[PDB]
Amino acid sequence: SSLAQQLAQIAANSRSSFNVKALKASHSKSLIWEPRVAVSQTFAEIYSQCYEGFKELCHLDSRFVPFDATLFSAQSQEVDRTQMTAEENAALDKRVDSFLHLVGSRLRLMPAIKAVEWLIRRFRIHEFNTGTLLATFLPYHTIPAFVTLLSILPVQRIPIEYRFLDPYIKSLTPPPRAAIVQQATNRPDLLSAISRYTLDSCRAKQEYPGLISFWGGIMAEAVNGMIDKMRSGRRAIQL
Amino acid sequence: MPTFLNKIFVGRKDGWVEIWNVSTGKLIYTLLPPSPDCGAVTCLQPTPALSLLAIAYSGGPLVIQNVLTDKTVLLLEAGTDDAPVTSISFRTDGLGAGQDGRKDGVMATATSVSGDVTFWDLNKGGRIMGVLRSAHNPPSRHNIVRGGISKIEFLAGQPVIVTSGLDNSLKTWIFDESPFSPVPRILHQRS
Amino acid sequence: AEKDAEEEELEKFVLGAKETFREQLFRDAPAWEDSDDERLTISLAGATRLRKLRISESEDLVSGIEYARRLRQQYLRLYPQPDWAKPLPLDSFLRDANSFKV
């Protein structure tokens, strides 16, 4: 069925729907409301509620104003990411990333959540900047927000390190920190990824003690377990 | 030099490198290495960058230089005085550095006193990234088993990288992508 | 500008702000010298490999230095310059190859 191998390669490497059925479901994945309203939630009220939460966030913290200009304007209310060019898309991705790194501080707050919901239902951040959002939500991995995001995540879109959350997607309960650390011990790539994320944040001077405590704890337990693996007895393999 | 005109680059037994305009048969420039304790240039190769060369001294440093400004660009304590780097090759792909496989600037260095090849990631300040330990058989003077590594090429544009040694063996190795690989895996061999 | 600010606000309101959204998204001398390369020139159009590096449909005979600059341009367009072409105790420790013996 080598044909079918090729085709499913393409079809999960898709980025835009083309039958109405996959369109409706792709629109109905969302965080706050239910699918059976989010289907026919049109593109004003989404911007309405989310911009309200955005105002709350901007009055709390200062440096959100360029994101106000560029990612929440009324033309952004209908920009269709699906039809720009690649370098545009990447610049957009950079803007997306920096916004996530700033917002992940105030994550237990409803206006922040609303802001991310805007990002998802418009730019499909969960589909096209998957690894970043999963990265910036991993620190809060015990919370109802994380489980809901876990629900709406697209499976084959999950980055290759983070694929290990699939049985939790099959069973919508949050994973616990021991599960995370065990995958962290086995792989180098997940640990490299978490460290590179949080390094990007603190390079950006956007870190915060919860995230740093998270990262330190996970790195420490991972390195403990890794030396537990690397012990050999045999001189050369230990070296 | 990839884009220079009728110039060849020769190295000396002394640590010097001499640029020769081969058109009229004229020595046109000579260059010297920093910290003259490094003795003899062992191997040299032009980078994918512009005007940028890798000289390798027996004394242990590699160096890469702007061969028209004669300013050091990177310096590497890259061989021992016992183990001199004797053939290198740069990857020309576009991806493979910065601990995420996305960035470029990877190079491979080889001696002939060992059989283990080494991969640097150039990007921040030129860190090491890995060692294909014992690609060929490790050479030994007391042992009947021949060893030692002849040359390494990163073939252009592709992440394959061909090695051969003394011990009648030609192997080829490749980086994957979706697991990032520090050290490659073997994807042909003939022995 | 010859426009009023509230008029531009209207232009925002009804025509949209598409282009401005796009813009808001998109917010060593040579040590040695040669003489013979000055002395050289080359028939570009007479070459076929070197046809693609001219400027107009008039350049055929170009001096060595300029020809070289064209060649460097084509090297750039063919293989763009990597960014590493543009101290810490531990980073030095990493970058030293002597700290990896067995």
């Binding site: - | 884009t3 009728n6 020309t92 490749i174 | 060649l71 063919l78 293989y79």
Partner: peptide
């Protein structure tokens, strides 16, 4: 299984031919 690598495809790569340093 994810993470196990694909075929080896020779990638269509153009390099700088160097027979023009005359």
């Amino acid at each position: 299984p994810v993470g196990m690598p694909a075929k080896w495809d020779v990638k269509e790569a153009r390099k700088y031919n160097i027979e023009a340093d005359g």
